[PDB]
């Protein structure tokens with residue numbers, strides 16, 4: 001069925017399923033629609049014979065150069081997507097709710113790529129975008145398919161971040177702290193401003209645009225201090241670097257960062273160490289450091305993130321598209 005966002009009780013059940021699901025994703029939580037307040041929310045779900053929710057999908061509709069909308073369920077749906085018969089059922093509900101207004105329904109779940117899975121999806125009528133598309137550009141995928149994920153369940157005895165790494169890396173992580181760097185965290189307006197100052201500075205230094213502060217304020221208003229947390233690194237009164245991490249489902253996700261120009265005393269390493277500590281203290285299964293463009297020392301994102309994740313980067317299935325309007329799809333989507 002389709003979720004009535006005006007029914008507190010219905011909404012409560014939807015959230016309770018999302019928050020308790022091992023497949024939960026913050027970008028599938030109802031709070032995400034509040035962050036993306038410029039998009040239109042349309043959410044659906046399936047129930048079992050007991051009337052209990054077994055699958056859900058939070059979609060957001062965006063405008064395009066055409067009379068059709070772009071329906072996107074970021075990192076959804078919430079369920080075991082390899083169970084394609086169930087997926088088809090959930091999708092059919094989504095399709096019904098979209099009511100012909102969208103030219104496509106796209107979802108990019110965090111499930112490993114495999115020829116077997118890719119083939120099944122294609123056999124079921126879906127159009128997939130992964131190893132067959134451009135690694136970048138407006139034709140690339142919305143979310144990076146390659147991601148540096150730290151699997152903490154491999155270290156059941158880990159008490160502190162250092163316990164996860166070899167001596168050489170322990171050295172790199174100890175450096176900033178040994179040099180006076182200190183990190184405090186929370187989710188207050190004060191910490192958001194601190195983040196914003198480093199965020200805009202880093203953006204200017206990199207010649208890129210930055211999201212407005214209101215974006216993060218909506219995020220702060222949507223998620224409590226146990227879900228969203230900002231880490232601020234400083235040295236003797238000098239703001240150095242920051243990072244924003246979200247804890248949801250089976251992982252804590254390093255989503256945004258900022259760092260001042262000049263000498264930063266490896267403050268970014270300190271931020272990472274504290275985010276990882278938060279994962280450990282909360283018994284979280286995974287710490288996700290985000291995407292990379294390529295697994296090579298030529299990728300600076302890979303270089304930084306490889307310090308904390310020595311395992312191979314995870315490669316997801318990519319974008320799964322349920323083509324609704326063929327003509328428009330071919331116009332707006334190409335390899």
Ligand SMILES: [Mg+2]
Nearest residue numbers: 280281282283
């Ligand atoms: Mg623990």
